């Protein structure tokens, strides 16, 4: 999930936007 | 600010800034 992808590893704008409504 | 390790309030803040008027879902357990 998001924690694994952005917290435990380096985030990206591409992945962050996957969580926008 | 997006291209780093983002946890907790830092991650929530990034989602807020990136998603703007869309809003977002923060699902740390999923």
Q: How was this structure determined?
A: X-ray
Type and span of the H or E element at B10: helix B9-19
How many DSSP H helices and E strands does chain A contain?
Answer: 2, 0
Q: How is residue A18 written in tokens?
A: 């996957």
A2/B21 Cα distance (integer angstroms): 20
By Cβ distance, the residue of B14, B24, B27 closest to A21 is B24
Asked if B26 has any chain A CB less than 8 Å from its own CB, the reply is: yes
B2 with B18: CB under 8 angstroms?
yes
The CA–CA distances, whole Å, from B8 to A10, A21, B16, B26 equal 14, 19, 12, 10
How close does chain B come to A3, measured CA to CA in Å? 6
Tell me how many residue pairs between chain A and chain B have CB atoms under 8 A apart.
63
Type and span of the H or E element at A13: helix A13-17
| Sign of the CA dihedral running A17, A21, B6, B12 | positive
The DSSP secondary-structure symbol of A19 reads T
B7 with A3: CB under 8 angstroms?
yes
Task: Report the 10 Å Cβ neighbour count for A16.
Answer: 21
A20 with B23: CB under 8 angstroms?
yes
By Cβ distance, the residue of B3, B29, B30 closest to A10 is B3
């Amino acid at each position: 999930g998001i924690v694994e992808q952005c917290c435990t590893s380096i985030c990206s704008l591409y992945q962050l936007e996957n969580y926008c409504n | 600010f997006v291209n780093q390790h983002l946890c907790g309030s830092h991650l929530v803040e990034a989602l807020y800034l990136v998603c703007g008027e869309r809003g977002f879902f923060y699902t740390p357990k999923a």
